[PDB]
């Protein structure tokens, strides 16, 4: 259209539909993810976040970023590192698997936070904005399904507790987006890299899947 907000919405329109279809994320919203496969996409979120995060650290003060940059409300690197300690244990760090799905959505993560940074938004974007526009349903099956016992730890990431309004938020976000100069050709890259997150991330599904039939 004419804002980069309602660019990328509909642009990836067909590759969410991919990533909700994905075997994996399938068996979820139908509440069918044992421990152990739950317990391997919160070391997919930990490692991408982090990575992601990390970027984002880099280019701060970047004006190809700046705009977005929103810590205390976003990140989650404190969230899963919390929820991680839950699902492995007090080792989780020396424990927790790092897969190669797991691995080429850090590597892209990097080479775009070094040599195009004015991605990073698009990732920045899919990741925070996605689980943003829809982390209730992920939280309501999560809960349900899993009946983990009454710990009350290992879901934090779910809750971005320095935002009250989801929707005032992301209406600051998109506003912010739209507001962050690019030349047309970065425009419709950006927008092809919002593709590329959907595929790197439908592509950990099925390498999460693989995984658990074993
Ligand atoms: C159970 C699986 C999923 C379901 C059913 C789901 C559902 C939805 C729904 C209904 C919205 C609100 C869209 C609107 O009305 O504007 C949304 C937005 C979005 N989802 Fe998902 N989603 C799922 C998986 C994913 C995944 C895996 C990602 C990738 C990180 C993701 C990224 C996004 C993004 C970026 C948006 C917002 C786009 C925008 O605001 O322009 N979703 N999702």
Same mark, same amino acid.
């Given at each position: @259209?004419?804002? +980069?907000?309602? !660019?990328?919405?509909?642009?990836?329109?067909?590759?969410?539909?991919? !990533?909700?279809?994905?075997?994996?994320?399938?068996?979820?919203?139908?509440?069918?993810?044992?421990?152990?496969?739950?317990?391997?996409?919160?070391?997919?979120?930990?490692?991408?976040?982090?990575?992601?995060?990390?970027?984002?650290?880099?280019?701060?003060?970047?004006?190809?970023?700046?705009?977005?940059?929103? @810590?205390?409300? +976003?990140? *989650?690197?404190?969230?899963?590192?919390?929820?991680? !300690?839950?699902?492995?244990?007090?080792?989780?760090?020396?424990?927790?698997?790092?897969?190669?799905?797991?691995? *080429?959505?850090?590597?892209?993560?990097?080479?775009?936070?070094?040599?195009?940074?004015?991605?990073?938004? !698009?990732?920045?974007?899919?990741?925070?904005?996605?689980?943003?526009?829809?982390?209730?349903?992920?939280?309501?099956?999560?809960?349900?399904?899993?009946? +983990?016992?009454?710990?009350?730890?290992?879901?934090?990431?779910?809750?971005?507790?320095?935002?009250?309004?989801?929707?005032?938020?992301?209406?600051?976000?998109?506003?912010?987006?739209?507001? /962050?100069?690019?030349?047309?050709?970065?425009?419709?890259?950006?927008?092809?890299?919002?593709?590329?997150?959907? /595929? +790197?991330?439908?592509?950990?599904?099925?390498?999460?899947?693989?995984?658990?039939?074993?």
């Amino acid at each position: @259209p004419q804002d +980069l907000s309602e !660019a990328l919405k509909e642009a990836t329109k067909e590759v969410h539909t991919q !990533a909700e279809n994905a075997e994996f994320m399938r068996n979820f919203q139908k509440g069918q993810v044992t421990r152990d496969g739950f317990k391997l996409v919160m070391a997919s979120l930990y490692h991408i976040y982090v990575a992601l995060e990390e970027e984002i650290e880099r280019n701060k003060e970047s004006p190809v970023f700046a705009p977005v940059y929103f @810590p205390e409300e +976003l990140h *989650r690197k404190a969230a899963l590192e919390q929820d991680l !300690a839950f699902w492995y244990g007090p080792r989780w760090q020396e424990v927790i698997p790092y897969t190669p799905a797991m691995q *080429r959505y850090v590597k892209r993560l990097h080479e775009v936070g070094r040599t195009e940074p004015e991605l990073l938004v !698009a990732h920045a974007y899919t990741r925070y904005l996605g689980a943003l526009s829809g982390g209730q349903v992920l939280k309501k099956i999560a809960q349900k399904a899993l009946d +983990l016992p009454s710990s009350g730890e290992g879901l934090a990431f779910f809750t971005f507790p320095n935002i009250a309004s989801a929707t005032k938020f992301k209406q600051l976000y998109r506003s912010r987006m739209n507001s /962050l100069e690019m030349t047309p050709a970065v425009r419709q890259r950006v927008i092809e890299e919002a593709k590329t997150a959907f /595929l +790197l991330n439908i592509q950990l599904f099925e390498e999460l899947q693989e995984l658990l039939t074993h």
